[PDB]
């Protein structure tokens, strides 16, 4: 979890306006000393984390490295693989709600679970064992972006008014699934546009 958290804060910290101040040129290159100073100024990384990040960075003979490639190399795999750990810990937390060891294990993972809150989707389905079950899945950022479009919101409002006012308790879910298919097409079209 420390590995994942350290490489998930990196995208936020390198994209901060403070970092842009520390690299006025914006050429994607920075010295190790200036990168260390930026990390210290952010005040989110400890000294061990900063030393580890510097050791990871492949500097030059001039003591400079392209931090954009550094972030591309380490943040993306972390963002890809840490979601599963987040889902595992969320599953355990929700299905063992009265456990102390689990909480003592979750405390180090607060900064990871808080990164995947936007990307973690929860639903409840009547499962095969005749019991309600919770399903966790991943949500892409483009999905939210298209769900926030004006035409999609118009379609959602029209559907909600139609179904709630006149849809009826029976056939409401068939109408909802039809709306879901139409909205998936609308979101694909909006991404194209």
């Amino acid at each position: 979890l420390k590995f994942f958290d350290m490489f998930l804060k990196l995208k936020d910290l390198t994209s901060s306006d403070t970092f842009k101040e520390y690299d006025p040129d914006g050429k994607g290159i920075i010295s190790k000393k200036e990168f260390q100073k930026a990390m210290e100024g952010q005040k989110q990384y400890t000294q061990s984390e900063i030393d580890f990040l510097l050791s990871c960075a492949e500097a030059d003979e001039n003591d400079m490295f392209n931090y954009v490639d550094f972030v591309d190399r380490f943040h993306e795999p972390a963002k890809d693989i840490g979601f599963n750990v987040a889902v595992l810990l969320t599953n355990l937390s929700e299905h063992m709600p009265n456990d102390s060891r689990l909480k003592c294990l979750l405390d180090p993972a607060g900064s990871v679970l808080n990164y995947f809150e936007p990307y973690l989707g929860r639903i409840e389905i009547m499962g095969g064992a005749k019991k309600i079950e919770r399903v966790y899945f991943e949500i892409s950022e483009s999905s939210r972006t298209q769900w926030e479009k004006p035409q999609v919101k118009e379609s959602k409002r029209q559907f909600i008014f139609d179904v709630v006012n006149e849809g009826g308790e029976q056939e409401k879910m068939e109408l909802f699934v039809n709306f879901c298919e139409d909205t998936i097409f609308e979101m694909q079209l909006a991404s194209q546009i």
């Binding site: 989707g121 929860r122 639903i123 409840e124 399903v135 899945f137 991943e138 949500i139 999905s143 769900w147 909802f176 699934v177 879901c180 298919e181 909205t183 998936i184 979101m187």
Partner: peptide, 17 residues
């Protein structure tokens, strides 16, 4: 907003597809 959110059901359908 967390347990039963219709947007989450739409996103689950997209995820399945």
């Amino acid at each position: 907003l967390q347990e039963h959110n219709l947007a989450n059901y739409l996103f689950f359908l997209m995820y399945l597809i």
